[PDB]
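Running co-folding for uridine 3',5'-BIS(dihydrogen phosphate).
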Amino acid sequence: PSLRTQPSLYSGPFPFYRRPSELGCFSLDAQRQYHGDARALRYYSPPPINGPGPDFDLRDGYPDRYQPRDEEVQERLDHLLRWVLEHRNQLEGGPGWLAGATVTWRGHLTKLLTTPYERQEGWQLAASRFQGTLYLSEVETPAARAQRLARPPLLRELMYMGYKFEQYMCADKPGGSPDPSGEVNTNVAYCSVLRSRLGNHPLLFSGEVDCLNPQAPCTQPPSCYVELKTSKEMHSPGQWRSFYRHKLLKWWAQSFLPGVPHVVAGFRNPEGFVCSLKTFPTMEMFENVRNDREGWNPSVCMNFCAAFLSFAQSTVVQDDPRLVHLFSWEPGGPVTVSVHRDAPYAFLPSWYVETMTQ
RNA sequence: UUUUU
Ligand SMILES: O=c1ccn([C@@H]2O[C@H](COP(=O)(O)O)[C@@H](OP(=O)(O)O)[C@H]2O)c(=O)[nH]1
Ligand SMILES: [Mg+2]
Ligand SMILES: [Mg+2]
């Protein structure tokens, strides 16, 4: 019992994907404490129209003004579960809607979408059915853990630079001004909780959002959100082509799901400065590879994801929060399944299970 | 968040 991942198997018509609706949000503060509000939301604030072009020093503050979240702490779905617990009787869709849904992080769905084309990094997804609801929580693979622990100094800095770029592009208040003199604390995060549906699979998922754009004529989330990104400066048509085929696929896969309409990219030079900005509308990303023999196709991404959801739902028959069906995948092969009980794979906490049961 | 496919 396995699931194949080749694009050729999923090249059919684009499947049904419900326009995402924001059900709520939550913020994690500097101490990684949960708050059921939008206190962590920042606002899009690009360089003044009449001022000089951007010249953001992404290395500024590294590492003295860097407070990185502890990656050894595996939160899994915990924060999202707290939101669900605090909103279980306020969910739309009618009675039993949650019972037929699949709950997970936007990032987990993004990895599913890119699976047909990914050739370097594999993954593992733990699944448990509890009160009908199917929960999907990613598991760091042994290899990914090793790669993380062996993270090169350069990669460590590049990760900081991505967060630093946000600091140069966001203000704490609408129409306010960015403040690059502060600390980059990655425990801080604003998450949107959304409702959608792929095929006949209702979805409830949360995703971290970079900022809200006040200037945007459309003020209703998620349409008012913006995704920020950094990438190396490119000069040759060849570099741009590679960017379209590989990087854009991941940018599209991340922003399409939550309904974030724009991705603003900061291109950094070898010295670590962002001296150029470009906006990539999510719904136009595919245009760059539509007639490309080596490009990606959104339909393949979504059809595979729908296929995996069907596969997971049919495989996880037993309603038991202590039972886990681990779905494993490595480039070059199909998605396989193994069954496990309790620690270490079980991920639904007793505080959630006991409350939902009572 | 980021390097690469
Ligand atoms: O990128 C891929 C590549 C392969 N597969 C699968 O790996 C299994 C063994 O084929 P092989 O690659 O020759 O080792 C086959 O499924 P099978 O066991 O025959 O149903 C391929 O379809 C897949 O799902 N994605
Ligand atoms: Mg983000
Ligand atoms: Mg971003």
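Result summary
The helical segments of chain A are 78-87, 106-114, 142-149, 153-169, 237-256, 298-315, 350-357.
Chain A has one domain: 1-358.
Job closed.
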